[PDB]
């Protein structure tokens, strides 16, 4: 009875503190910046071989190798320059939802509705790809996973928690609690010190890896958050939701900066990604196409309209010379 | 090109051949999703994710039981959905109706037909004969309900269980008729814990669904 009033007072204190710093907006300081103009991108490669909907995609660090997952139960590694296939990995369960590529290029991980994260070894003396370890402990389905090094990995699940794992022993070292709904997306900072998670409670949190405590909590969306991306400098969020809205958050001003929306868009958002310089923001929609946004102006610079179904995957290379998309029509396309 | 590129191309072609070979076998199995609440008797209808397999007339089926707002998106390619309701517990029929309404109107399931099982008829019949609990205590509209003249009761059944069974079936069907516009159909069935013919009903309903899809494909409907 007494703690609710204290919580309300603290929330009012935070709200009053945030309003005091809103001395300007992005839409006013950018009046002296020229528009990017019209951006045209065309398909350079088409990747065929999948027989079902594609759910996940991730680039390598060399900007040539690519890994993709589909509901047919197989994991494919592509050579983007020649369209040749490098490996084909059968899965023990066909209900896969995420995949990842190790920064050293030696391991790949995946998971889904089986509540298990599995790690595969790509460089063996026998010539075959084999499973190295299975990570168990979650109670819900697995929604996203990302490598930190060859021995550390972070996972997010639908049981409202996130975890940090030790691949050598298979034991969970830190558990992150504080969400009230299913956790959808993760994004790892360039300095490998903080990470961000979105959830179905329409909130975003910043986590400290080294201590396991939540540092900041952001709100504003009216529905579930589907994707989260990390601006290159380490000080911004990019989030997408099912209410057809994208928002930009800052970790130092601790509030929202700019909103990306349009009256003709009434579908959800599935993926968000940035360019190298951060000027362009890429987003996937259920309207069977992908839109290109100007991050500093909330305008529309272009559109990619080559798919015949929902867009589920989106990624950008480390050198910035290509963009890859994945859809439910069983096709992959490389844009430039 | 270099010789190593030719060998890589040969390896890629072999990988493509092996991928194509695997797809043919997968296409011969029909996939089903099982949904229902506790006490409904899901586990007995055909006796992270639980799986089961059965075969009728040289056709293979694969049924999945998960454990709903998020993971339902990945089951939009299944042939049909099976829903089980306990028809001998009046306190919880509104929960079942709300769940059925929430499933029927889901935006990702607009093209999937539903096979509806109304289970545990014997307990309902015993309770109706006993007269220790009345439907009118929970559904006031039942007092004005009359059995249709086109009813086909099973021989030997007292004309007090048919009224209740048809009232429940009408209550479930009326939701399905309010929306759908012909894109999917409901197939009501009455079952019990001891019935064994349940396998044939799924086979017939799936054959009918595929027939409807074929009719739509040839510009006949």
């Amino acid at each position: 009875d007494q703690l609710r009033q204290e919580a309300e007072q603290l929330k009012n204190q935070i709200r009053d503190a945030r309003k005091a710093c809103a001395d300007a907006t992005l839409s006013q300081i950018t009046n002296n910046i020229d528009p990017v103009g019209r951006i045209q991108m065309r398909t350079r490669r088409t990747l065929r071989g999948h027989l079902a909907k594609i759910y996940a995609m991730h680039w390598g660090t060399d900007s040539r190798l690519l890994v993709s997952a589909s509901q047919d139960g197989k994991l494919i590694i592509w050579d983007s320059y020649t369209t040749n296939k490098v490996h084909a990995i059968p899965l023990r369960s066909s209900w896969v939802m995420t995949c990842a590529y190790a920064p050293s290029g030696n391991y790949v991980a995946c998971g889904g509705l089986d509540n298990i994260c599995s790690i595969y070894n790509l460089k063996t003396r026998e010539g075959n790809v084999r499973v190295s370890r299975e990570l168990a402990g979650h109670t819900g389905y697995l929604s996203c996973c990302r490598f930190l090094d060859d021995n550390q990995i972070v996972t997010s699940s639908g049981d409202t928690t996130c975890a940090l794992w030790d691949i050598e022993t298979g034991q969970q070292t830190t558990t992150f609690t504080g969400h009230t709904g299913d956790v959808m997306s993760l994004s790892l900072a360039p300095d490998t010190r903080l990470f961000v998670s979105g959830a179905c409670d329409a909130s975003a949190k910043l986590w400290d890896v080294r201590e396991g405590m939540c540092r900041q909590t952001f709100t504003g969306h009216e529905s579930d958050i589907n994707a989260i991306c990390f601006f290159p400098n380490g000080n911004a969020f990019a989030t997408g939701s099912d209410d057809a809205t994208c928002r930009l958050f800052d970790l130092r001003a601790d509030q929202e900066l700019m909103t990306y929306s349009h009256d003709n868009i009434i579908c959800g958002i599935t993926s968000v990604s940035f360019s190298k310089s951060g000027r362009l923001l890429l987003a996937g929609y259920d309207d069977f196409n992908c839109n290109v946004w100007d991050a500093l102006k909330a305008d529309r610079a272009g559109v990619l309209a080559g798919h015949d179904n929902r867009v589920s995957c989106l990624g950008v290379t480390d050198d910035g010379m290509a963009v890859a998309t994945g859809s439910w029509d069983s096709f992959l396309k490389i844009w430039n | 090109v270099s010789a190593e590129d030719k060998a890589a191309a040969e390896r890629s072609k072999m990988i493509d051949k092996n991928l194509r070979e695997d797809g043919e076998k997968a296409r011969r199995t029909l996939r089903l999703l099982l949904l229902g609440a506790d006490n409904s008797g899901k586990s007995t209808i055909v006796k992270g994710i639980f799986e089961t397999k059965f075969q009728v007339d040289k056709v293979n089926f694969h049924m999945f039981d998960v454990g709903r707002r998020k993971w339902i998106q990945c089951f939009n390619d299944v042939t049909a959905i099976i829903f089980v309701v306990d028809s001998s517990d009046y306190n919880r029929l509104q929960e079942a109706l709300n769940d059925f309404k929430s499933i029927w109107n889901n935006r990702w399931l607009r093209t999937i037909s539903v096979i509806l099982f109304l289970n545990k008829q014997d307990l309902l019949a015993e309770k109706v004969l006993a007269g220790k609990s009345k439907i009118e205590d929970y559904f006031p509209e039942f007092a004005r309900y009359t059995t249709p003249e086109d009813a086909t009761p099973e021989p030997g059944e007292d004309p007090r269980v048919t009224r209740a069974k048809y009232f429940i079936r009408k209550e479930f069907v009326d939701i399905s008729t309010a929306s759908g516009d012909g894109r999917h159909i409901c197939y009501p069935h009455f079952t019990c814990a001891v019935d064994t013919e349940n396998a044939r009903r799924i086979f017939n309903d799936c054959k009918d669904i595929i027939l409807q899809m074929n009719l739509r494909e040839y510009n006949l409907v």
Partner: single-chain antibody
Amino acid sequence: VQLVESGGGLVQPGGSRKLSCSASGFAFSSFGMHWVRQAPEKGLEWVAYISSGSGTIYYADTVKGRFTISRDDPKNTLFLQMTSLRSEDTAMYYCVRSIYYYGSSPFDFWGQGTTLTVSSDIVMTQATSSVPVPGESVSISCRSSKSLLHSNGNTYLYWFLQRPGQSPQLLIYRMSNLASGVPDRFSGSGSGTAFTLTISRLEAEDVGVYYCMQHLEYPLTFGAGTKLEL
């Protein structure tokens, strides 16, 4: 990972014999296979190549019409059929494993070998018979008749080391890539038609003959061989 060869013996001119190789410890069906011949006073010579799927087959210009290579995946065995043998065929025969994709190491493992007793090409040039020489730096050079730099950015030069009584071992592939299990004392560099091999500090295990090989076009060609005497 183990390859064992069988067959061999003494034959008369005009006869025939069949060789075999038994493989174990790896996915035999995913690898391509080669046969390499070494004469007592000639060095290494390539004979034939068979693909993993039996798709493509190549032969040397001195064995066409007389040698036949075959594969048996369910039994994990290799075969080489030889007819109308001549005096020039007396030599040691080796079996070599190869796999081809982006980033692979196509000449990583060599067999042990068997002995047989009877009774346009790119020229790879080495010229030094013996380099006398622990703890000192040694440089070995190779020179080719035609450039090995392809338009895709790759240069196809390979280095091998043969210790006394041992099979050749891979050190460097594609001129800069150190093979697995090799100590970091080895390095290599070059450009165009001139290549060098550098050893930072010699040990007692660095005594043997070093060979150069190109992989631009068939047939595959070897160098004369450079002997390092400690």
